[PDB]
Every structure is written in structure tokens, then in C-alpha cells.
Amino acid sequence: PIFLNVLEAIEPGVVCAGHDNNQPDSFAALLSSLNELGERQLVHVVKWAKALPGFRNLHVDDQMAVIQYSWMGLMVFAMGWRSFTNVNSRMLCFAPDLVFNEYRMHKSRMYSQCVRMRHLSQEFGWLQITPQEFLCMKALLLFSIIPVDGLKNQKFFDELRMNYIKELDRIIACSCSRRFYQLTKLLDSVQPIARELHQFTFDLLIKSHMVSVDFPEMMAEIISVQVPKILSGKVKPIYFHTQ
Numbered sequence: 298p299i300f301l302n303v304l305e306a307i308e309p310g311v312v313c314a315g316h317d318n319n320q321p322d323s324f325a326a327l328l329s330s331l332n333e334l335g336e337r338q339l340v341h342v343v344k345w346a347k348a349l350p351g352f353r354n355l356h357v358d359d360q361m362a363v364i365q366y367s368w369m370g371l372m373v374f375a376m377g378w379r380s381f382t383n384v385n386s387r388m389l390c391f392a393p394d395l396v397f398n399e400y401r402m403h404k405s406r407m408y409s410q411c412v413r414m415r416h417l418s419q420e421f422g423w424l425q426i427t428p429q430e431f432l433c434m435k436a437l438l439l440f441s442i443i444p445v446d447g448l449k450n451q452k453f454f455d456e457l458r459m460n461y462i463k464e465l466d467r468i469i470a471c472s473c474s475r476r477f478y479q480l481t482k483l484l485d486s487v488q489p490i491a492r493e494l495h496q497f498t499f500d501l502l503i504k505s506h507m508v509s510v511d512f513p514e515m516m517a518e519i520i521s522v523q524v525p526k527i528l529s530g531k532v533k534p535i536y537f538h539t540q
């Protein structure tokens with residue numbers, strides 16, 4: 298069980314948003330706190346990804362690219378699992394110091410996207426996803442979004458993605474076929490949610506000065522440089538099933 302030992306060992310711990318819960322639940326304060334959480338989580342996502350089995354097999358340029366394409370889905374999927382585990386998906390647990398209730402969902406101007414994130418969180422309960430299945434599915438999310446014109450070394454990526462699909466199947470083999478259908482469907486469902494949030498954050502970055510929303514340095518870079526490749530169709534999710 299080397300592979301699972303590794304995924305358990307490298308799993309990031311708790312990250313706080315730094316949100317001042319004393320201030321009013323305004324759009325500006327909530328989204329500025331979410332952006333800071335994003336910057337703080339990205340540090341952990343990079344360190345995690347670089348530690349995954351096989352990741353250093355990819356070209357160095359491909360290593361950064363897959364992180365910068367996949368972070369939104371990785372972070373939403375992990376938040377959905379934290380929300381399930383902490384509060385049975387009742388609220389969205391972005392961080393211990395930034396839990397969205399109904400009011401914050403409305404004030405954030407993301408109510409509909411939050412509804413979809415809550416549905417994803419609830420699937421963890423409905424499907425009785427185990428921690429092992431969660432860890433293997435989250436690793437596969439890293440290898441689920443790539444440029445249409447290919448990566449620098451596409452073959453190395455294809456081999457690695459194949460290996461993570463095999464590991465997900467092995468975890469299931471510990472019926473089997475039905476479970477695999479369910480888990481791949483759940484993985485695909487993260488992508489449309491990530492696309493909605495990519496569009497929202499891109500639009501918010503462009504108008505950020507007008508609405509007093511702060512974007513930290515790495516977030517502003519990734520959202521203006523890499524996110525538009527996704528929104529313009531140059532970088533696309535790899536779906537299991539026909540959409």
C-alpha cells in the first residue's frame with residue numbers, strides 16, 4: 298500500500314483564511330478573504346503536487362502548468378470534502394475562520410455557485426466516499442485539465458494520468474464497475490463548477506478596483522495569465538464521460 302501511504306502522508310493540513318469575522322459580511326471583505334485563502338492554499342497545493350508519486354517524471358514546465366490549470370478544481374473538491382467531514386455539508390467550510398452560511402452565500406454574489414458546491418459536498422455523503430477514494434480522486438484532478446495543443450511532454454503526462462486512473466481502480470477493488478462509474482461521474486462534475494468559478498473570478502479581477510476587492514500577487518498572476526487560456530478554450534478539462 299505504498300501509494301496510499303504516500304497520499305496520506307502528503308495531504309495538506311488546515312489553512313486559515315485570515316478573515317476578520319468581526320467585520321460586516323460585505324462583498325468586498327468576503328471576496329478579499331476568499332482571494333487570500335486562495336493564495337495561502339496555492340502554496341500548499343504546489344508543495345503537495347510536487348510530492349505526488351511520479352510527478353517529477355513530468356517536464357518541469359508541465360509541472361507548473363498542470364498546477365496552474367487545475368488549482369480551482371482541486372481546491373473546490375477539497376473544500377467539499379472538508380464541508381462534508383466537518384459539518385455534513387450543511388455549510389461551506391472554506392476555512393475554519395471562513396464558513397459560509399446562507400447570508401454569506403448571498404452577500405458573496407456567488408449564491409448559485411455555492412449551491413453547486415454544496416451539492417458536490419453532499420455527494421461525498423450520498424456516495425459514501427471513503428478517505429482513500431477522496432485522496433485518489435483528488436490526485437487525479439491534478440491530471441484532468443491540459444492545453445488543446447498538448448503539454449511540453451504529453452507522453453509523460455499520459456502515462457502518469459493512466460497510472461492514477463489505475464490506482465483509483467485498485468482502491469475500488471479493495472459492483473467494482475458500478476463504483477468506478479460513480480466516482481468518474483463525480484470527478485467530471487467538478488469541472489463545470491470550476492468553469493463557473495473561473496469565469497466569476499476573471500470578471501471580478503477585471504473590475505476589482507471598482508468593487509474594492511483585493512487580489513494577492515499569485516492569484517492576480519494566475520487569473521490574468523492562465524485562467525483566460527481556459528476561458529478562451531486553449532486549455533480544456535479531460536472528461537471521462539461524454540458531456
Ligand SMILES: C[C@]12CCC(=O)C[C@@H]1CC[C@@H]1[C@@H]2CC[C@]2(C)[C@@H](O)CC[C@@H]12
Nearest residue numbers: 331332334335338372373376391494498
Ligand atoms: C479557490 C477558493 C479558495 C479555497 C477554497 O476552499 C475554495 C474556494 C472556491 C472559490 C474561490 C476561492 C479563491 C478565490 C476565488 C477564485 C474568488 O476570486 C472567486 C471564487 C473564489
